[PDB]
Write an enzyme that holds these catalytic residues in place. Structure first.
Site, PDB file in Angstrom:
ATOM      1  N   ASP A 144       0.850  -1.187   0.000  1.00  0.00           N
ATOM      2  CA  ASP A 144       0.000   0.000   0.000  1.00  0.00           C
ATOM      3  C   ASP A 144       0.887   1.239   0.000  1.00  0.00           C
ATOM      4  O   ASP A 144       1.638   1.481   0.946  1.00  0.00           O
ATOM      5  CB  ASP A 144      -0.932   0.016   1.214  1.00  0.00           C
ATOM      6  CG  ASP A 144      -1.834   1.240   1.253  1.00  0.00           C
ATOM      7  OD1 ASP A 144      -2.639   1.390   0.364  1.00  0.00           O
ATOM      8  OD2 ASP A 144      -1.711   2.015   2.172  1.00  0.00           O
ATOM      9  N   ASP A 167     -18.087  -8.756  -2.969  1.00  0.00           N
ATOM     10  CA  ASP A 167     -16.842  -8.173  -3.452  1.00  0.00           C
ATOM     11  C   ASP A 167     -16.955  -7.681  -4.889  1.00  0.00           C
ATOM     12  O   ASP A 167     -16.532  -6.558  -5.183  1.00  0.00           O
ATOM     13  CB  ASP A 167     -15.705  -9.194  -3.350  1.00  0.00           C
ATOM     14  CG  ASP A 167     -15.271  -9.455  -1.914  1.00  0.00           C
ATOM     15  OD1 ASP A 167     -15.663  -8.708  -1.050  1.00  0.00           O
ATOM     16  OD2 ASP A 167     -14.550 -10.400  -1.696  1.00  0.00           O
ATOM     17  N   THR A 186      -1.438   7.608  -4.949  1.00  0.00           N
ATOM     18  CA  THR A 186      -0.294   8.315  -4.379  1.00  0.00           C
ATOM     19  C   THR A 186       1.019   7.755  -4.915  1.00  0.00           C
ATOM     20  O   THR A 186       2.007   8.488  -5.050  1.00  0.00           O
ATOM     21  CB  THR A 186      -0.303   8.235  -2.842  1.00  0.00           C
ATOM     22  OG1 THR A 186       0.684   9.128  -2.309  1.00  0.00           O
ATOM     23  CG2 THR A 186       0.001   6.817  -2.380  1.00  0.00           C
ATOM     24  N   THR A 187       1.042   6.461  -5.241  1.00  0.00           N
ATOM     25  CA  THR A 187       2.246   5.844  -5.792  1.00  0.00           C
ATOM     26  C   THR A 187       2.670   6.509  -7.098  1.00  0.00           C
ATOM     27  O   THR A 187       3.835   6.889  -7.262  1.00  0.00           O
ATOM     28  CB  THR A 187       2.035   4.337  -6.026  1.00  0.00           C
ATOM     29  OG1 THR A 187       1.761   3.691  -4.777  1.00  0.00           O
ATOM     30  CG2 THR A 187       3.274   3.716  -6.653  1.00  0.00           C
TER      31      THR A 187
END
Lengths: 543, 518, 230
Positions: free
Chosen positions: A61, A400, A94-95
């Site tokens: 993450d 899911d 954000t990566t």
């Protein structure tokens, strides 16, 4: 490689400026970006994060990795705040934001060495940014391609591939999409959104998994209170009265003993205790409630009147299920009666206005199905499978899969991912640069090239040779961006991306690789701001 | 601070190899000793693979993962502790020339390892043999395998019987097309609680079917047993009764205290008379019981137990039949202790017990352990837990796998043959598991004292042409059949061992970077 | 394959240091074995001197650095609670057993092979002992033999001159408390009391008790032939 003992600017502190700090700015921002570079994409690799005590955690993450990253050099702390803004506003990406920001800064240093003043780099980058966002606006689209083909099937089929239900994904992938498409609502003032919770899921062991049922409306996990009640009622127009308050013979008090001596008292008590709930039944019948759903239960005398009136009364309902019926059918639950101290079921306000309610047999199970109603955006699925143990896992997978598809649909405007945005901007912005002819031509060219760090990193993380995966993208996108500026087309094939599993170039729109536009717009804009914040620092003083 | 790239990869494998090496020669019936020097100046020669790994400090996070890996194994399966650590380390070692020298990306090695796991699991099934988990005598013969060379081996019939009754009581033995097959869900951690009571001997251990309370009563001297019990489960306290108002009691004058006590006396008596209406033999109150209430109920010939939490009454009701009610006036005439032989209040070792056993099995049991000392009780408890663990491992699946390295050898041979049809880059790291499996039959030979190559080569030939049930004789070092030399182990051990070993290797292979920071 | 702040001996070095340490402990205590052995000095670090030949005293009062020799010292000392003697014998046997085993291990003999051979020899050694022993006459009146027992024990520990003094004292003290009808005995019935200002050769057996506090008046009787005790 270090910088200290300036022995100048006679102060109680250190002075580092010029190319010295600029070299540190590049090394610092690269060192931080390298932390998250390897984790980009679903095929990326994780890392261990080791604390100062002796414990550690493993994660891929980007938000956690950057939050727990020990950053010493102030130049890298700019990237920390960069990530924090992305996490607060968007919550993802954000990566790629950190990775792009570092590549912009590194290349900016090369422009400075080539005698391009930082002021002209900052301006030129912002010029490229404003045009880059305009370009994205011409690529993005709303939820489309559902006629003659469906892309959400690739979404659902992928999401369930890890679960037991995936064995029959060629069937169940349609159950996911067709169900969720049916529960689009408007909230207030036309938001056009899918609920965070929709598509009520039941289960049955009756038949094989491929016989699972898709119900156009809500499925209630209940049956009629009495087998004498109709299983099909009022096909023309049926009303549902959803109550919490009981219709069980009333108790005057739990803490009082009633002592009956006078025969007159027998009449008073017998009629009063029954009258409370029987009079309520009269109001339920008079309001047209041919389906009556009560949480706290219904007495036998009350049920008898419902049977004679051909009313599908139900006792021991789950309140949560009634909230779903009430909201879906435009009604609110009868938790109490008032309206100036009177008694009523509030016809058309607390009663649902539905087309038809039936009880269906599922081969050794039963439930009540509500087919239609004026305005609901509701649906239900009943899953079948090998046994209850498989049905639990299948239900968990459907929950899911619906979440995955919903997230994609929630964004009213989406743009293909997989490098489509970065590769397309690379070619388009490179052409933009040619209209300047001054200084910004170089800043725009380097800005455009910087965006390729994403499809390059994705290819490396996939274990594929980036020199072919990225080059092929440039070829495919160049074809679309050579035709685009001329406004000449009959069929236009664009948005090619990386298939990071098979190692090939695919059409991402049909493959289903979609990212919200708000993510791409704010990720690209944010990445520049950090580059500028670092590039503007040509001096550091330490006191 | 930070280690990246191939240095992180080498560090992860290196540390994992070290941990596997620490206990490499601690496997097998002839396990070697290990000398552990304590910082405090002492030392032990323990060969216990768990203690050796526990009591050795490690630095590398990868080594710490292997330590937690062994803890996970212990919680899932009562055995396989050292097999997981050795196999997991060897797999990483065998993947090393592929990760570093051949430059094969971790994603390819991990994918190949996952396929190797799938194939290995099927092979373990193929080489298994069935057992009749309904035949107690057959199970006793298997359970004793965990009892041998333990103190209580002389009473192993009782240790097996307790394990058989305890596991079967909690075992979900069911099969159908509606709920599905539970696969013999067994919980020997909570539902077979074991209690050690001073006195008696090993053979005096008993299994209880019901609830045992350790809480004392208002009158420790009670009839030895109750043949016609009736149990009251009541929340409401037996004390001065207050209303629903916020009214407080404030007494200033010394003479007025009698007004509150006199009122309480009447109210408490009336409540107790309501309890006695059903002629109880044991009254249990969740809230407090006033001194007067204790006398009113006791004097009628009835035990009183105060301040018992709801979590106890909820279990007491399942084995007594008593209804749990809120108000004293909610008690029913049906609150009886029928379907029970007797309730016993016998004191053992000068400690009060209340046995609420009946003729029903509430999906649970409790085992009473007896002995002439705490040391005896501890040995019985520890040795019984082994009996219960193996009883669970067998009754979890009616199948055994051949030991002595036979199963691990069979997996290696079958994976090696399967590799021939696995064309592509994955063929290379795929072999890594087939080679890694040898670490078990190799260790057994090393402890026997034979040549690790010449004796393994004979074993491989036997598996290549012969049966998969060929292994290493622990005492002689010869290659022998596991039919004559039974050495059978519950299949769950081999299935969990290869599963957790490969999964751990896949985790560490995924970590190309270790980053410090808080 | 090593974590920082740690060390391990992986190759045969682990065996060499274990045998070497045992050989050291042997080379010290072997000199205390037998009536012709030497006498060891212990210094408590405060300047007090204690002399002994007793294995247990040597092992339990002396400090050892070699962690391996510590294990031998403790295991041998445990014999005091089992037999009361033989501590030095065990250390001597352990040393030579490791010496001989090492000679074979050098030839490629796996330690397990030696271990199993030791267990076979042990089982046969116990059979030998049972057939080698002589059954003693069950009479407790056999003072002549019991003197031989006390003498053999004392000669290990004293200068052989004190043996002539202590031998009849040990023999009669134990026989005196030996219960009638050939029952057991508790040697805690013999009080061990020290006093100064007399030579070690004056050690004597007292039929009864000796009390510390005496009379405190010059006219107290010196000796009474028979007395009643209040």
């Amino acid at each position: 490689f270090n910088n200290s003992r300036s022995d100048t600017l006679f102060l109680g502190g250190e002075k580092i400026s010029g190319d010295d700090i600029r070299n540190q700015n590049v090394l610092a921002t690269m060192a931080v970006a390298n932390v998250v570079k390897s984790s980009l994409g679903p095929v990326g690799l994780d890392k261990m994060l080791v604390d100062d005590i002796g414990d550690f955690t493993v994660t891929n993450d980007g938000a956690t990795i950057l939050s727990l990253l020990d950053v010493q050099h102030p130049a890298g702390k700019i990237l920390v705040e960069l990530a924090q803004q992305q996490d607060r506003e968007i919550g993802d990406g954000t990566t790629s934001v950190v990775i792009i920001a570092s590549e912009l800064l590194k290349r900016a240093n090369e422009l400075v060495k080539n005698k391009i003043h930082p002021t002209t780099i900052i301006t030129g980058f912002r010029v490229a940014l404003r045009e880059a966002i305009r370009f994205i606006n011409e690529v993005l689209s709303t939820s489309v391609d559902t006629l003659g083909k469906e892309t959400l099937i690739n979404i659902a089929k992928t999401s369930m591939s890890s679960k037991i239900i995936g064995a029959d994904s060629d069937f169940f992938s349609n159950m996911v999409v067709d169900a969720l498409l049916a529960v689009k609502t408007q909230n207030s003032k036309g938001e056009i959104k899918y609920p965070v919770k929709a598509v009520n899921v039941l289960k049955a062991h009756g038949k094989s998994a491929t016989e699972s049922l898709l119900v156009p409306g809500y499925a209630l996990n209940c049956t009629v209170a009495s087998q004498a009640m109709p299983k099909r009622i009022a096909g023309g127009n049926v009303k549902i009265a959803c109550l919490d308050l009981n219709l069980q013979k009333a108790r005057m008090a739990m803490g009082v003993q009633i002592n009956i001596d006078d025969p007159e008292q027998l009449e008073q008590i017998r009629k009063r205790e029954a009258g409370i709930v029987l009079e309520r039944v009269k109001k339920i019948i008079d309001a047209g409630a041919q389906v009556v759903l009560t949480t706290k239960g219904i007495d036998d005398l009350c049920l008898k009147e419902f049977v004679e009136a051909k009313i599908m009364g139900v006792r021991r309902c789950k309140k949560e299920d009634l909230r779903r019926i009430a909201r879906a059918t435009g009604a609110t639950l009868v938790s109490s009666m008032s309206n100036l101290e009177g008694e009523e079921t509030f016809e058309s306000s607390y009663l649902g206005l539905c087309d038809e309610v039936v009880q269906a047999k599922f081969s050794d199970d039963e439930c009540i199905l509500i087919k239609g109603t004026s305005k609901h955006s509701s649906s239900s699925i009943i899953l079948r499978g090998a046994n209850d143990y498989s049905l639990d896992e299948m239900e968990r997978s459907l929950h899911d899969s619906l979440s995955v598809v919903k997230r994609t649909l929630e964004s009213g405007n989406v743009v293909p991912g997989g490098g489509c945005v970065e590769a397309a901007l690379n070619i388009y912005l490179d052409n933009f640069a040619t209209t300047v002819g001054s200084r910004e031509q170089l800043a725009i060219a380097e800005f455009a090239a910087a965006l390729l760090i994403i499809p390059k990193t994705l290819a490396v993380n996939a274990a594929k040779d980036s020199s072919e995966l990225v080059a092929k993208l440039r070829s495919y996108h160049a074809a679309s961006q050579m035709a685009k500026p001329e406004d000449v087309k009959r069929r236009s094939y664009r948005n090619y991306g990386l298939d990071l599993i098979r190692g090939k170039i695919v059409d991402e729109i049909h493959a289903g690789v979609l990212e919200p536009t708000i993510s791409k717009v704010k990720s690209l804009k944010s990445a520049l701001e950090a580059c500028v914040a670092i590039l503007r620092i040509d001096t550091m003083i330490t006191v | 601070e930070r280690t990246t790239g191939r240095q992180a990869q080498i560090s992860n494998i290196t540390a994992a190899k070290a941990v596997a090496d620490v206990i490499r020669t601690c496997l097998g019936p002839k396990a070697m000793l290990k000398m552990l020097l304590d910082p405090m100046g002492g030392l032990v020669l323990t060969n216990d693979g768990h203690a050796i790994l526990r009591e050795i400090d490690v630095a590398h996070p990868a080594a710490k993962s292997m330590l937690e890996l062994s803890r996970t194994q212990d919680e899932e399966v009562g055995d396989g502790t050292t097999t997981v650590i050795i196999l997991a380390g060897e797999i990483l070692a065998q993947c090393a020339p592929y990760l570093i020298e051949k430059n094969i990306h971790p994603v390819i090695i991990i994918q190949a390892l996952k396929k190797a796991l799938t194939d290995a699991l099927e092979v373990i099934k193929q080489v298994s043999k069935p057992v009749d988990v309904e035949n107690d005598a057959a199970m006793k013969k298997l359970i004793q395998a965990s009892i041998g060379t333990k103190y209580v081996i002389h009473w192993s019939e009782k240790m097996c019987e307790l394990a058989l009754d305890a596991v079967k009581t909690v075992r979900k033995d069911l099969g159908q097309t509606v709920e599905g097959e539970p696969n013999f869900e067994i919980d020997i951690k909570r539902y077979v609680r074991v209690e050690k009571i001073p006195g008696g001997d090993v053979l005096d251990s008993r299994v209880l079917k019901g609830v045992l309370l350790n809480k004392d009563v208002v009158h420790p001297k009670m009839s030895r047993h109750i043949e016609n019990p009736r149990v009251v489960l009541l929340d409401c306290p037996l004390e001065y009764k207050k209303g629903e108002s916020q009214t407080n009691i404030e007494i200033e004058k010394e003479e007025d205290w009698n007004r509150i006590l006199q009122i309480e006396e009447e109210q408490v008596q009336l409540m107790c008379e309501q309890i006695l209406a059903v002629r109880p033999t044991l009254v249990i109150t969740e809230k407090g019981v006033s001194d007067l209430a204790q006398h009113y109920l006791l004097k009628g010939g009835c035990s009183v137990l105060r301040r018992v939490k709801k979590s106890d009454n909820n279990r007491i009701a399942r084995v007594t039949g008593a209804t749990i009610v809120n108000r004293v006036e909610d008690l029913k005439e049906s609150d009886v202790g029928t379907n029970c032989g007797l309730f016993k209040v016998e004191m053992i070792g000068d400690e009060y017990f209340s046995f609420l056993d009946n003729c029903k099995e509430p999906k649970a049991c409790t085992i009473m352990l007896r002995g002439g000392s705490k040391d005896i009780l501890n040995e019985i408890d520890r040795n019984l837990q082994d009996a219960m663990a193996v009883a669970r491992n067998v009754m979890l699946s009616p199948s055994l796998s051949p030991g002595g390295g036979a199963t691990e050898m069979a997996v290696s041979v079958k994976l090696a043959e399967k590799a021939k049809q696995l064309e592509g880059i994955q063929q290379w790291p795929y072999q890594a598991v087939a080679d890694a499996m040898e670490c078990i039959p190799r260790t057994l030979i090393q402890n026997a004292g034979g040549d690790p190559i010449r004796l393994l080569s004979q074993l491989r030939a036997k598996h290549a042409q012969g049966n998969f049930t060929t292994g290493i004789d622990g005492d002689k070092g010869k290659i022998v059949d596991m039919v004559s030399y039974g050495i059978w182990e519950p299949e769950v051990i081999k299935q969990q061992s290869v599963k957790t070993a490969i999964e751990s290797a896949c985790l560490l292979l995924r970590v190309d970077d270790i980053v410090s920071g808080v | 394959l090593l974590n920082p702040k740690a060390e391990s001996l992986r190759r045969d070095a682990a065996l060499k240091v274990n045998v070497t340490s045992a050989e050291g402990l042997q080379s010290v205590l072997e000199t205390n074995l037998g009536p012709k052995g030497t006498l060891k000095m212990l210094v408590d670090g405060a300047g007090n001197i204690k002399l002994t030949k007793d294995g247990k005293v040597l092992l339990t009062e002396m400090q050892i650095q070699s962690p391996t020799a510590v294990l031998i010292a403790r295991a041998a000392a445990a014999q005091d609670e089992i037999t009361g003697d033989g501590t030095t014998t065990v250390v001597c046997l352990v040393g030579e057993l490791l010496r001989q085993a090492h000679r074979f291990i050098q030839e490629g003999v796996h330690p397990r092979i030696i271990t199993d051979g030791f267990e076979i020899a042990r089982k046969e050694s116990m059979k030998f002992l049972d057939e080698f022993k002589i059954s003693k006459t069950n009479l407790s009146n056999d003072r002549e033999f019991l003197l031989q027992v006390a003498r053999s024990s004392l000669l290990t520990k004293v200068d052989a001159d004190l043996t002539e003094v202590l031998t009849p004292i040990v023999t009669d003290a134990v026989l005196s408390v030996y219960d009638a009808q050939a029952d057991n005995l508790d040697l805690h019935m013999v009080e061990i009391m020290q006093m100064q200002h007399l030579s070690p050769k004056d050690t004597t057996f007292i039929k009864g008790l000796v009390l510390d506090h005496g009379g405190r008046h010059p006219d107290m009787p010196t000796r009474v032939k028979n007395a009643y005790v209040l």
